[PDB]
Ligand binder design. Structure first.
Ligand SMILES: CC1=NN=C(c2ccc(N)cc2)c2cc3c(cc2C1)OCO3
Ligand SMILES: CC1=NN=C(c2ccc(N)cc2)c2cc3c(cc2C1)OCO3
Ligand SMILES: CC1=NN=C(c2ccc(N)cc2)c2cc3c(cc2C1)OCO3
Ligand SMILES: CC1=NN=C(c2ccc(N)cc2)c2cc3c(cc2C1)OCO3
Lengths: 796, 796
């Protein structure tokens, strides 16, 4: 016996009925075929829906296919659950777990929330039409409360379409007042078409806008209107046309007679009619399985008009409902399986984007995994992070303290790190920072043609790029491509900061200079001799004055040292000598004390090297450079006279003046107590000078001029994008901001600012220790002279 | 009598033919009738045009109305010139002078260039169609060469009906390679519609784009679809529907049956049909005038064919041509006149813009006056200006060096003035800098209620806004209102910078302080007395030493002066006295010379006063404020103890310490040479302190916290917008930039650090002049003592 089924189609659903008849033709079999009796109803009218439902129920219908609306979901559910009559529908799923309702439409709320999370949306509008229920609006509000979103929900279904359908222009100005560029269209195809028309009219389909079409019919709309505006349009598709079943259906679908099959003869199919076809498949499979299980469900050709008291449900409905539940098939809408409540499970919803060349899939969504990308256009060349070989040193690449759990790009900070970050941001590639295995910047080995590991790994591609403190030079640039310099500097000489001068034993002579002391002694002898000669050549008895040669010497000594003698000249010429010597000693003593006072104030005495010219002349202070660095190669090939002199020294030095690392050079400078100097680039020298301790400074006038560049292996396609990005950074001045941050904002060396002033201390015994030694020596000498006299008269 | 005329109507010119028939009905008359013979043909085919022309000539057509194209203009012009047959056309005007061609379409090149130069365009794209001639393109290129425009001319018409594709997108992305937001559409209605459709499709109709529809049919096309995009759309209109005659025509045209007259039953008509109607008017007026002149217009029998050898013309053609030329009427397209070449003159082109509410006229263009604005709906809205009141103050409102010829606001400067006048620009007029009439910030007269110049002018409405160094205070808030203060300030005290202290007569005593000198004298007497006591009470027999009281005094004086004595104590107690006095004198002399050295090296300034209390405590210093400025009100209002003391002084002070102007106060400070002090706002104190000469300084902290604001009469509508503008400027931080530019960046008197001392220079006689006076006085005293002794023994 033929299975009598019922059809409840909405008015104007021509395509749905055409797909229904197509499914009836396709799934008809030799043993039997379903015989539907259909009525066309205004599904929004519950009274008409009930009339049709009871007309079919009294007709002997075993299962009712059809549609419902927000105004008729409840009556359909209640009648089906009370009379135990199964309802297979492609309309929107019921909010609750309603029995005897087979729901062919998958749940969209989870897919919509996952897609919103994928784009990392927090602020967005949610334009909804209430014709399919507010379940998705409730879901987005609940998930906004949970996830801290800001959702502006606007109801567009209240527009009085009976008269006009134009209030959207005033609607979108509210979004303009809220600066909402991200909008969700929870509407069916007609309403989303109207929204898109008004969006285009007011010019909001342009770059910067993003629309999500919150329905399973992304391609069923007129997407071509908004395709070229530049705004992102994305949505969900249940009918993935790139499949065997859908393609086989559509090749016949496009060739059906349009008058016989209204809505057919098109390259695309509305998802509602696709679900209608899949529902026909499901229910015919269910009935064939029921017969295959030898289950009989026949009943008499009359019913209780839905209004018998009490209700009289047949018993075999549970069997039919279970058969419908356990049906699992493959169809146009993907895998089809229902849980015990009729909700579809194991389904897949495709996520698509509307690009300039058309709408195409970007991934899919499933009940077991959320928002899985399609993995199309697979990687293999540019998804791998590039290997950046750099070197470790304080101003550019540092080891961060909490290295026990930090990762490759988080373990390191500095100028190189953030410059690489900015260059990658402009070029659009991902990266990892690695240290150079050789631990040195590398240079060619002379006469042996041996290269360090950097050249081999660059050739092999293991060293993808070298964003590192590497200097521009001709020898390297013919072997590896170099970008435009981001910093200009040169080689500088770095010496230990001199300490305060330590007084010597004979430092009491310091204020007045050696030649002045020589001439003071000579003037003393001359004054004494002239005084004696004046006083004693016949002045007309002899010895009328005490001024013999020895007494003249004693008087001259007393006058210099400002100790009044026991005798004074009484002649004119002798008094002339005395007065001029007195003037001399007054000026000299005043000069000594005034000079000493000047020196005891005002610090900062002497400096070892001034312009690296004296460095090349003097031989006590040994000086060297980094080994295998650019500076050493600079000194080899420099034909400048002073630079050639410096190279001829540095090559022939008996001890090793070179060091492997910059830290080793700084440690050698600090350890070698001022008699070593290290030639290193200006920037690192400034950084070390500003760091603590401040025991080293920069001297010399920036010997040469060189620039830092990002190294690239020869012929690499990455050479020009990094070159243009570095030029962009140089012209925009962000490099200057990084320079300020990493050098000028960390001037921790307060001694350079010279903001503090010391207090003069008491003179130490060391400052005048020499006069004590001269005093004791003279006392001993006097005793010795006295004893001699007594003995004589007693007988990069 | 009837006159036969010809018709050259393109196939598809249905509205043109309908307007022709309507004009023939309307301008019909009983005295004579026009008999049209009409051929419909492809005007782009010269063969068809010429064969129709010859067919119409063969039947003695008096004058030929019709249209032509770029491919057929020359045929018409040549045949009309050779056969002396007049041609009346609404088509594009001929590129040069041509007889027997009456042209109804006004020239657009001048209007287009005027509209371009009104928007101050200098870089725009020019999209042109070839079907209407390249004369406009040539004029644009010539004017661009003359005026240095950048014109990107693109031949949109090159993609003809055979090359029919949606390739405009490639064109518009080509324009995006140059950032060309300004586009001119030199195309007819159809091509303009296609361009606008593609513009809307790819989102080029958004705000920031501006289009000039370069044709006389701005409003006859479909402008509605681009109306709401936000992009500016402007054009030209020859038919003004607000005119009486045009309205009378359209109120009958719109009601006429469209089935009988194609293109009728519309609220608007294409301008070409309007020119067809006016051409019928002109032709019938010309023939009426010919009849009124009784010209023998009867034709000489058979006209013959075109290809006559020689092509002898008929003589009536020149009379007919002149009659057509000298017709002057008013019709749908405004006033109608023709020059000797047939080009229309005295015409008016309406300039229109596409607003959100529809296209509207913004002006009109004529041969005599070019691009005159209509001022309708713009000349709306006491004073038509904003008379900003300022006060001449150096940091805020200076007088320009070129005051003898500068005019307007350029005579002064102001940033906040023009930011506040942005609101006036929104109102629709510029700002005018004006100096306050009484030159004072203004204050209420106490107990008399007499109103100051500001008191009246900012409440009578004579000044609708005031920008000045006018300070916020409570007394003014009850009568006027202020915006948020835009800078901070405080009342501060300004005094003359002290000069270097010149030495006094007795400045040689300065290093050691008065108490030390007193105690030195007392210690001298004590030491001398004790020495005499220990050396002269009975040693056992007295007179064994020379140390009497006078000799003891002499020895102690010599020991202090470090001048050798003649006697020495020669006893234990006496030598104890001597040694302790020697130690005293060593320390004292060293201290004197060391402190003198310290003073002569470092110069300190120490201002006479340091705080507000110093002014209150010091009575000699005369200090005052500006009269009528907010500072004087602050001193009355203040109940603070120190400020109440200051006011109780200044109120009952010596001859008036107040001044009228800031310049007067500064001149008083500089003139008083130290003993005057001026209390005024700090900002002017830093300004004047940084200016030359720097003989003034700011001393002490700010007496209070105050601020300037924008003044406004009570309840005026400008208050809220200027308050919002000030708050926005404060948030934008431009006020800080202005502060830096006007105060910090000037500098010119920057203070030096603790170093950079000037050279010491020699010690002047004044520094030691008093010691000379004491020496000479002592010498005179010694002479006096000696003479006395000789005389005695001689007998805002
Ligand atoms: C480290 C120094 N400190 N002491 C003395 C010095 C000399 C004398 C006395 N009484 C105390 C201290 C000195 C003086 C100078 C000078 C260098 C020195 C060396 O150059 C210019 O005069
Ligand atoms: C460049 C000179 N430097 N030395 C002396 C000078 C004077 C005396 C002695 N014993 C040594 C040196 C000098 C001193 C001055 C002066 C200018 C000079 C000239 O103005 C203020 O005192
Ligand atoms: C303008 C000054 N200039 N001369 C002397 C002064 C004293 C003695 C000699 N020989 C030269 C100059 C002075 C010294 C001072 C002092 C103020 C002055 C006044 O305060 C601390 O010691
Ligand atoms: C605050 C003091 N100020 N005065 C003396 C001092 C010493 C002697 C005389 N006659 C006057 C004043 C002083 C001198 C110093 C010193 C610390 C002081 C302490 O360290 C370097 O020499």
């Amino acid at each position: 016996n033929s299975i009598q089924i019922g059809g409840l189609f909405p008015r104007g659903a021509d395509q749905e009925y055409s797909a229904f008849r197509v499914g009836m033709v396709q799934f008809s079999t030799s043993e039997f075929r379903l015989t539907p009796h259909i009525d066309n109803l205004e599904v929004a009218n519950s009274f008409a829906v009930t009339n049709a439902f009871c007309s079919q129920f009294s007709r002997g219908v075993y299962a009712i296919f059809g549609f419902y609306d927000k105004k008729s979901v409840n009556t359909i559910t209640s009648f089906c659950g009370t009379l135990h009559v199964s309802f297979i529908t492609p309309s929107f799923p019921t909010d609750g777990t309603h029995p005897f309702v087979i729901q062919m439409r998958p749940d969209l709320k989870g897919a919509l929330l996952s897609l919103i999370e994928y784009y990392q949306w927090d602020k967005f509008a949610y334009l909804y039409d209430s014709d399919r229920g507010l379940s998705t609006l409730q879901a987005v509000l609940d998930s906004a409360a949970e996830k801290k979103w800001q959702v502006t929900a606007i109801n567009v279904g209240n527009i009085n379409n009976d008269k006009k359908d134009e209030t959207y222009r005033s609607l979108f100005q509210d979004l303009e007042l809220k600066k909402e560029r991200r909008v969700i269209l929870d509407c069916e195809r007609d309403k989303v078409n109207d929204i898109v028309d008004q969006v285009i009219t007011i010019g909001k389909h342009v770059k910067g806008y993003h629309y999500i079409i919150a329905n399973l019919g992304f391609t069923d709309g007129d997407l071509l209107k908004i395709q070229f505006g530049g705004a992102e349009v994305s949505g969900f598709q249940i009918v993935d046309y790139d499949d065997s079943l859908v393609s086989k259906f559509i090749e016949r679908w496009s060739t059906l007679e349009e008058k016989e099959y209204p809505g057919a003869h098109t390259a695309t199919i509305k998802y509602t009619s696709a679900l209608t076809y899949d529902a026909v498949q499901v229910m015919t499979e269910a009935f064939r399985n029921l017969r295959k299980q030898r289950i009989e469900i026949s009943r008499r050709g009359n019913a209780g008009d839905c209004l018998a008291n009490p209700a009289v449900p047949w018993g075999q409905g549970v069997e039919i409902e279970r058969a419908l539940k356990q049906v699992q098939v493959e169809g146009l809408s993907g895998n089809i399986k229902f849980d015990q409540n009729g909700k579809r499970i194991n389904y897949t919803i495709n996520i698509m984007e509307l690009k300039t060349n058309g709408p195409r899939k970007i991934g899919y969504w499933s009940e077991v995994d959320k928002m899985v990308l399609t993995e199309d256009d697979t990687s293999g060349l540019e998804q791998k992070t590039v290997v950046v070989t750099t070197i470790l040193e304080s101003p550019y690449v540092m080891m961060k303290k909490n290295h026990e759990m930090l990762e490759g790009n988080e373990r390191y900070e500095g100028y190189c790190v953030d410059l690489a970050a900015e260059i990658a941001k402009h070029c659009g590639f991902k990266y990892k920072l690695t240290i150079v295995g050789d631990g040195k910047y590398g240079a060619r080995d002379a006469d042996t043609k041996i290269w360090n590991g950097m050249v081999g790994e660059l050739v092999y591609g293991k060293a993808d790029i070298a964003i590192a403190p590497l200097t521009i030079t001709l020898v390297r640039e013919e072997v590896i491509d170099f970008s435009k310099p981001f910093m200009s500097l040169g080689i500088s000489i770095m010496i230990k900061k001199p300490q305060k001068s330590k007084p010597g034993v004979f430092s009491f002579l310091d204020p007045l200079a050696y030649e002045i002391w020589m001439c003071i002694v000579f003037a003393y002898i001359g004054v004494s001799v002239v005084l004696f000669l004046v006083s004693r050549f016949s002045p007309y008895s002899e010895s009328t004055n005490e001024f013999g040669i020895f007494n003249s010497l004693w008087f001259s000594l007393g006058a210099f040292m400002q100790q009044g003698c026991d005798i004074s000249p009484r002649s004119l010429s002798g008094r002339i000598v005395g007065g001029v010597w007195w003037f001399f000693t007054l000026i000299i003593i005043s000069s000594y004390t005034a000079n000493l006072a000047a020196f005891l104030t005002v610090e900062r005495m002497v400096s070892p090297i001034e312009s690296a010219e004296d460095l090349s002349k003097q031989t006590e202070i040994a000086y060297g450079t980094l080994d295998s660095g650019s500076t050493k190669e600079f000194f080899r090939r420099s034909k400048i006279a002073v630079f050639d002199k410096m190279w001829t020294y540095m090559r022939s030095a008996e001890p090793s003046v070179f060091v492997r690392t910059t830290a080793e050079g700084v440690a050698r400078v600090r350890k070698s107590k001022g008699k070593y100097a290290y030639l290193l680039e200006s920037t690192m020298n400034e950084y070390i000078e500003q760091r603590k301790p401040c025991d080293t400074m920069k001297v010399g006038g920036n010997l040469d001029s060189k620039g830092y560049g990002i190294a690239t292996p020869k012929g690499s396609s990455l050479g020009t994008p990094v070159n243009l990005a570095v030029l962009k950074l140089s012209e925009q001045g962000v490099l200057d901001k990084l320079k300020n941050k990493w050098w000028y904002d960390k001037g921790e060396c307060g001694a350079k600012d010279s903001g503090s002033k010391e207090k003069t201390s008491a003179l130490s015994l060391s400052n005048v220790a020499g006069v004590f030694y001269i005093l004791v020596g003279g006392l001993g000498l006097a005793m010795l002279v006295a004893l001699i006299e007594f003995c004589y008269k007693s007988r990069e």
